Ligand SMILES: Nc1cncnc1Cl
C-alpha cells in the first residue's frame with residue numbers, strides 16, 4: 121500500500137559520496153516499480169549492486185543499470201530479458217524523475233535514468249516510475265562528473281543498494 125523506498129549508496133572512483141533514495145510509484149506502475157525494487161535488493165540473484173552510471177550528461181540525465189554489458193547495451197529485468205511499457209501515466213516533469221531507458225517500444229530491462237532537467241519529449245516514450253526522495257544533492261554531485269557526450273571523468277558506482285523503511 122505504501123509506495124516502497126529504495127536507496128543507492130554512490131561512490132566516485134571507489135570513494136563514498138552519499139546516498140540517493142527513491143520513492144517507487146507502485147500505486148501507478150506496479151510492474152515497473154517491482155522490477156526496480158527487486159534489482160535494488162538483489163533478491164532474484166542479480167541487480168544493481170556494483171554497477172555504474174555509464175552515461176551522465178549535465179543538464180539532462182544520469183543513466184545506469186546495465187549490469188550485463190556495463191555500457192548501455194545490456195541489462196535484463198526480473199521478468200525476462202525485456203518487458204512491456206506498463207503505462208505512461210506519469211510524466212517527465214523535472215529533476216529527480218526516475219524513468220526506464222529503452223531501445224524501442226516494449227524493451228524495458230534494467231537500465232534507468234534520473235532526470236536532472238525537465239525532459240518532456242520523453243513523455244509517452246519512457247515509463248516514469250519513481251522520483252528521488254532524498255539526496256538530490258548527491259545526484260547533482262554525480263552530475264558534475266559527466267560531460268556533454270556522457271562519458272564520466274571518474275567511475276560513478278552503486279556501492280550498495282537496497283530497500284528502506
Ligand atoms: N517481448 C516481450 C515478450 N514477452 C514479454 N514482454 C516482452 Cl517486451
Ligand SMILES: Nc1cncnc1Cl
Nearest residue numbers: 192193221222223231
Ligand atoms: N537494452 C538497451 C540496449 N540499447 C540501448 N538501450 C537499452 Cl535500455
